[PDB]
Amino acid sequence: IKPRIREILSKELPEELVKLLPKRWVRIGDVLLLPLRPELEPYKHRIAEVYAEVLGVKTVLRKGDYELLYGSDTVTVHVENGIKYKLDVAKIMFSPANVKERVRMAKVAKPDELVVDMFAGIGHLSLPIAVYGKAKVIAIEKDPYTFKFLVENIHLNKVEDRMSAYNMDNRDFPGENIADRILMGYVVRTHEFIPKALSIAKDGAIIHYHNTVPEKLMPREPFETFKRITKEYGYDVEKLNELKIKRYAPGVWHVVLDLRVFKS
Ligand SMILES: CSC[C@H]1O[C@@H](n2cnc3c(N)ncnc32)[C@H](O)[C@@H]1O
């Protein structure tokens, strides 16, 4: 609400700085992500404080991982498309920059499927599936801290019946030829996980494969590379779909490819 923020802060800021105040922000649970121009640095705390008041949030992080500008408690529960996502906003990446994809996941699975989430996080991609798809889900998350939330989110959504969780590196995962669908929501050279994926996959399984490719190499990549690694195993793969996502600089998109693999 500009007027109120303006009314309060104009009382302490040069009108010149006033004009520069944040016009937008991101909100996650009761935590605010707030972007700030350089020339406002001296006043950052007071600014975050009044925005906290009028926007009704407990804590403010700098949007620009994140600097604490006001408050202390960065844990919160964020509700999206009917799903409760508990997280620690400061320590765990989560962005409505990717809400479309989480919505999509709500519309892909059939209740029979076994799905394996190789980079579960707090359940970003898997929860939508366990709730709307009604399919079974095994979810793997390496970080013990992240893992706590993943677990908690399973209860918060009343799916503990059809969704399990392991705090381990996906590489050490025992299952093989068990997955009808695989989630690979990771972006740091995800291609190094293709082999384990192919191992976990059943013949014909669908894989949601995320990664970050320079647009220079598009649309050859990232598929070519996926294709060739798969060849190393005598398996074949068909590209069903390629969506672009949080395309981000410099010069590299974040894409997701929907692929089917054939174990011959
Ligand atoms: C939240 S999006 C990416 C997620 O995958 C997790 N992750 C990264 N590498 C692995 C791995 N090798 N096995 C299981 N989870 C992983 C991260 O800790 C994070 O929560």
Coordinates of C-alpha atoms and ligand atoms in Angstrom, one line a residue:
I1 CA 0.0 0.0 0.0
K2 CA 2.1 2.9 -1.2
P3 CA 0.3 5.6 0.7
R4 CA 0.9 4.2 4.1
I5 CA 4.5 3.3 3.5
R6 CA 5.0 6.8 1.9
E7 CA 3.2 8.5 4.8
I8 CA 5.5 6.9 7.4
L9 CA 8.8 6.9 5.6
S10 CA 8.6 10.4 4.1
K11 CA 8.9 11.6 7.7
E12 CA 12.4 10.3 7.8
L13 CA 13.6 10.1 4.2
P14 CA 14.7 12.8 1.8
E15 CA 11.8 12.9 -0.8
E16 CA 14.5 12.0 -3.4
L17 CA 15.1 8.6 -1.6
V18 CA 11.4 8.2 -1.0
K19 CA 10.7 7.9 -4.8
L20 CA 13.1 4.9 -4.9
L21 CA 11.3 2.7 -2.4
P22 CA 10.5 -0.9 -3.4
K23 CA 7.5 -1.1 -5.7
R24 CA 7.4 -4.9 -5.6
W25 CA 8.3 -7.9 -3.4
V26 CA 7.9 -11.6 -3.1
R27 CA 6.0 -13.3 -0.3
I28 CA 6.5 -16.8 1.0
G29 CA 4.4 -17.9 3.9
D30 CA 4.9 -14.9 6.3
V31 CA 8.4 -14.2 5.0
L32 CA 9.0 -11.3 2.7
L33 CA 11.6 -11.1 0.0
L34 CA 12.4 -7.5 -0.6
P35 CA 14.6 -5.9 -3.3
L36 CA 16.5 -2.7 -2.5
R37 CA 18.4 0.0 -4.4
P38 CA 22.0 0.8 -3.5
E39 CA 21.2 4.3 -2.4
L40 CA 18.8 3.0 0.3
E41 CA 21.5 0.9 2.1
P42 CA 21.9 3.3 5.0
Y43 CA 18.2 2.9 5.8
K44 CA 17.7 -0.7 5.0
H45 CA 16.7 -1.8 8.5
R46 CA 14.1 0.9 9.0
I47 CA 12.7 0.3 5.5
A48 CA 12.3 -3.4 6.0
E49 CA 10.7 -2.6 9.3
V50 CA 7.9 -0.5 7.9
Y51 CA 7.3 -2.8 5.0
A52 CA 7.1 -5.7 7.5
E53 CA 4.4 -3.7 9.4
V54 CA 2.2 -2.7 6.5
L55 CA 2.6 -5.9 4.5
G56 CA 2.0 -8.1 7.6
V57 CA 5.0 -10.4 7.6
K58 CA 7.2 -11.6 10.5
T59 CA 10.6 -11.3 8.6
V60 CA 12.2 -9.5 5.7
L61 CA 15.1 -10.9 3.6
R62 CA 16.9 -9.0 1.0
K63 CA 15.6 -10.3 -2.4
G64 CA 18.8 -9.8 -4.4
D65 CA 21.6 -17.0 0.1
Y66 CA 19.8 -14.0 1.7
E67 CA 20.6 -11.1 4.0
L68 CA 18.3 -10.7 7.0
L69 CA 17.0 -7.2 7.0
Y70 CA 14.3 -7.4 9.6
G71 CA 13.0 -10.1 12.0
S72 CA 14.6 -13.4 12.9
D73 CA 12.3 -16.4 12.2
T74 CA 12.8 -17.6 8.6
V75 CA 10.8 -20.8 9.0
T76 CA 7.2 -20.6 7.6
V77 CA 4.6 -22.6 5.8
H78 CA 3.8 -21.6 2.3
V79 CA 0.5 -22.7 0.7
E80 CA 0.4 -23.1 -3.1
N81 CA -2.3 -24.7 -5.2
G82 CA -3.7 -26.4 -2.2
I83 CA -0.4 -27.7 -0.9
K84 CA 1.3 -26.9 2.4
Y85 CA 5.1 -26.4 2.0
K86 CA 7.0 -25.9 5.3
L87 CA 10.5 -24.6 4.7
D88 CA 13.3 -22.4 6.0
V89 CA 13.2 -19.5 3.5
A90 CA 16.8 -18.5 4.2
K91 CA 18.4 -21.9 3.8
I92 CA 16.2 -23.6 1.2
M93 CA 15.5 -22.4 -2.3
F94 CA 11.9 -22.1 -3.3
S95 CA 10.4 -19.7 -5.8
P96 CA 7.0 -19.1 -7.5
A97 CA 9.4 -18.4 -10.4
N98 CA 8.7 -22.1 -10.9
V99 CA 5.1 -22.4 -9.8
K100 CA 3.9 -23.4 -13.2
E101 CA 6.0 -26.6 -13.1
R102 CA 4.7 -27.5 -9.7
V103 CA 1.2 -27.1 -11.1
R104 CA 2.1 -29.3 -14.1
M105 CA 3.3 -32.1 -11.8
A106 CA -0.2 -32.0 -10.4
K107 CA -1.5 -33.1 -13.8
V108 CA 0.9 -35.9 -15.0
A109 CA 0.6 -39.0 -12.8
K110 CA -1.9 -41.9 -12.6
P111 CA -2.7 -43.4 -9.2
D112 CA -1.0 -46.7 -10.0
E113 CA 2.5 -45.3 -10.8
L114 CA 5.5 -45.6 -8.6
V115 CA 7.3 -42.3 -8.8
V116 CA 10.8 -41.7 -7.6
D117 CA 12.0 -38.2 -6.8
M118 CA 15.8 -38.1 -7.0
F119 CA 16.2 -34.5 -5.6
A120 CA 13.1 -34.2 -3.4
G121 CA 14.0 -31.0 -1.5
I122 CA 11.0 -30.3 0.7
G123 CA 8.7 -32.0 -1.8
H124 CA 8.6 -29.2 -4.4
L125 CA 7.7 -31.5 -7.3
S126 CA 6.7 -34.7 -5.6
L127 CA 4.0 -33.4 -3.2
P128 CA 1.8 -32.2 -6.1
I129 CA 2.0 -35.7 -7.5
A130 CA 1.1 -37.5 -4.2
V131 CA -1.8 -35.2 -3.6
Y132 CA -3.4 -34.8 -7.1
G133 CA -2.0 -37.8 -8.9
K134 CA -2.7 -40.1 -5.9
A135 CA 0.2 -42.2 -7.1
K136 CA 2.9 -43.7 -4.8
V137 CA 6.1 -41.8 -4.3
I138 CA 9.6 -42.5 -2.9
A139 CA 11.4 -39.3 -2.2
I140 CA 15.1 -38.9 -1.7
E141 CA 16.8 -35.9 -0.2
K142 CA 20.5 -35.7 0.7
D143 CA 20.5 -32.8 3.2
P144 CA 19.3 -33.8 6.7
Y145 CA 18.1 -30.3 7.4
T146 CA 16.1 -30.2 4.2
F147 CA 15.0 -33.7 5.0
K148 CA 13.2 -32.7 8.2
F149 CA 10.9 -30.5 6.2
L150 CA 10.3 -33.1 3.5
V151 CA 9.1 -35.4 6.2
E152 CA 7.0 -32.8 8.0
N153 CA 5.4 -31.8 4.7
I154 CA 4.4 -35.4 4.2
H155 CA 2.3 -35.2 7.3
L156 CA 1.1 -31.6 6.7
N157 CA -0.5 -33.0 3.5
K158 CA -1.9 -36.2 4.9
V159 CA -0.1 -38.5 2.4
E160 CA 2.2 -40.4 4.8
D161 CA 0.3 -43.4 3.4
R162 CA 1.4 -43.2 -0.2
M163 CA 4.7 -41.3 0.1
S164 CA 8.0 -42.3 1.7
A165 CA 11.3 -40.6 2.3
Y166 CA 15.0 -41.3 2.6
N167 CA 17.8 -39.0 3.8
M168 CA 20.5 -40.2 1.4
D169 CA 22.4 -39.5 -1.8
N170 CA 20.2 -40.8 -4.6
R171 CA 23.2 -42.7 -6.0
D172 CA 23.2 -45.0 -2.9
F173 CA 19.5 -45.9 -3.6
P174 CA 18.9 -49.7 -3.6
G175 CA 15.9 -49.9 -5.9
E176 CA 16.2 -50.7 -9.6
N177 CA 13.7 -51.3 -12.3
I178 CA 11.0 -50.0 -9.9
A179 CA 10.1 -46.6 -11.2
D180 CA 7.3 -45.7 -13.6
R181 CA 8.2 -42.1 -13.3
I182 CA 11.3 -40.2 -12.2
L183 CA 11.8 -36.7 -11.0
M184 CA 15.2 -35.1 -11.7
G185 CA 14.6 -31.5 -10.4
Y186 CA 18.2 -30.5 -10.1
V187 CA 20.3 -28.1 -12.2
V188 CA 23.9 -28.6 -11.4
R189 CA 25.1 -30.8 -14.3
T190 CA 22.1 -33.1 -13.6
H191 CA 23.4 -35.2 -16.5
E192 CA 25.9 -37.0 -14.2
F193 CA 22.8 -38.6 -12.6
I194 CA 21.4 -40.0 -15.8
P195 CA 22.9 -43.4 -15.3
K196 CA 21.5 -43.9 -11.8
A197 CA 18.2 -42.7 -13.2
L198 CA 18.3 -45.2 -16.1
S199 CA 19.0 -47.9 -13.4
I200 CA 16.1 -46.9 -11.2
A201 CA 13.8 -46.6 -14.2
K202 CA 11.6 -49.4 -15.5
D203 CA 11.4 -50.0 -19.2
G204 CA 9.2 -47.2 -20.7
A205 CA 9.3 -45.1 -17.6
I206 CA 8.9 -41.3 -18.0
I207 CA 11.7 -39.0 -16.7
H208 CA 11.3 -35.4 -15.9
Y209 CA 14.8 -34.1 -16.5
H210 CA 15.8 -30.6 -15.4
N211 CA 19.1 -28.9 -16.2
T212 CA 20.7 -25.6 -17.3
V213 CA 21.8 -25.3 -20.9
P214 CA 23.3 -22.3 -22.7
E215 CA 20.9 -21.1 -25.4
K216 CA 23.8 -21.2 -27.8
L217 CA 23.5 -25.0 -27.8
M218 CA 19.7 -25.1 -27.9
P219 CA 17.6 -26.8 -29.0
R220 CA 20.3 -29.5 -29.7
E221 CA 21.0 -29.6 -26.0
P222 CA 20.4 -30.7 -23.4
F223 CA 18.8 -33.6 -25.3
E224 CA 21.8 -34.7 -27.4
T225 CA 23.9 -35.2 -24.2
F226 CA 21.0 -37.1 -22.6
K227 CA 20.8 -39.2 -25.7
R228 CA 24.5 -40.1 -25.8
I229 CA 24.8 -40.9 -22.2
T230 CA 21.8 -43.2 -22.6
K231 CA 23.5 -44.8 -25.6
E232 CA 26.4 -45.7 -23.3
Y233 CA 23.9 -48.2 -21.8
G234 CA 22.4 -49.6 -24.9
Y235 CA 19.1 -47.9 -24.0
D236 CA 16.9 -45.6 -26.1
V237 CA 15.1 -42.4 -25.2
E238 CA 12.3 -40.4 -26.8
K239 CA 11.8 -36.7 -26.2
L240 CA 8.2 -36.1 -25.4
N241 CA 8.3 -32.4 -24.4
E242 CA 10.7 -29.6 -23.8
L243 CA 9.5 -26.6 -21.6
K244 CA 11.6 -23.5 -20.8
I245 CA 11.6 -22.4 -17.2
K246 CA 13.3 -19.8 -15.0
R247 CA 15.5 -18.9 -17.9
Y248 CA 18.2 -16.9 -16.2
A249 CA 21.4 -15.1 -17.2
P250 CA 23.9 -15.1 -18.3
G251 CA 22.9 -16.9 -21.5
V252 CA 21.6 -20.1 -19.9
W253 CA 18.0 -21.3 -19.6
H254 CA 16.8 -23.8 -17.0
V255 CA 14.7 -26.3 -18.9
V256 CA 12.8 -29.5 -18.3
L257 CA 12.5 -32.3 -20.8
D258 CA 10.0 -35.1 -20.5
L259 CA 11.5 -38.3 -21.8
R260 CA 10.6 -41.9 -22.1
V261 CA 13.4 -44.5 -21.8
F262 CA 13.4 -48.0 -23.3
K263 CA 15.7 -50.6 -21.7
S264 CA 16.5 -51.9 -25.2
Ligands
LIG1 C1 15.5 -28.2 -3.4 S1 16.0 -28.5 -5.1 C2 17.5 -29.6 -5.3 C3 17.5 -30.6 -4.1 O1 18.2 -31.9 -4.3 C4 19.0 -32.2 -3.2 N1 20.2 -32.9 -3.7 C5 21.3 -32.5 -4.3 N2 22.1 -33.7 -4.6 C6 21.4 -34.8 -4.2 C7 21.7 -36.2 -4.2 N3 23.0 -36.6 -4.8 N4 20.8 -37.2 -3.7 C8 19.6 -36.8 -3.2 N5 19.3 -35.4 -3.1 C9 20.2 -34.4 -3.6 C10 19.4 -30.9 -2.5 O2 19.9 -31.0 -1.2 C11 18.1 -30.1 -2.7 O3 17.2 -30.1 -1.6

